[PDB]
Amino acid sequence: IGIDKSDNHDYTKIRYADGHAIENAVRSSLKVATSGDCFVHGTMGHFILAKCP
Amino acid sequence: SVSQHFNVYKATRPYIAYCADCGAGHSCHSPVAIEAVRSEATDGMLKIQFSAQ
């Protein structure tokens, strides 16, 4: 999270692997959620931060 | 009509008040601030009062 497919910092991109090539997914579609709904407190690289109930 | 019921609010305004939480555990001074939950119906139906109109 935070880097576009073209290897550039971007706070609205998520490099998600697919087949053999990297893709670009909209960041606003992140739903880290236990039974409730975690309030994602900030992300970077491979690590999300959550405050799940 | 209902405008008569709202004839009182013409001399009122929302206010900013402390919250102690905004879904992220932080001081807010938010435009929306709960003041008193007033559960008094045996059926059960809260009467959340908060700093907005």
UniProtKB/Swiss-Prot annotation, chain B:
Species annotation: Semliki forest virus
Quaternary structure, from the entry: Processing of the precursor of protein E3/E2 into E2 and E3 results in a heterodimer of the spike glycoproteins E2 and E1. Spike at virion surface are constituted of three E2-E1 heterodimers. Interacts with 6K protein. Interacts with host MXRA8; this interaction mediates virus entry.
Protein name from the UniProt record: Envelope glycoprotein E2
Membrane protein topology class: Single-pass type I membrane protein
Coiled-coil ranges from the UniProt annotation: none
Compartmental location: Virion membrane; Host cell membrane
Function as written in the Swiss-Prot or TrEMBL entry: Plays a role in viral attachment to target host cell, by binding to the cell receptor. Synthesized as a p62 precursor which is processed by furin at the cell membrane just before virion budding, giving rise to E2-E1 heterodimer. The p62-E1 heterodimer is stable, whereas E2-E1 is unstable and dissociate at low pH. p62 is processed at the last step, presumably to avoid E1 fusion activation before its final export to cell surface.
Residues of the full protein shown: 334 to 386 of 830
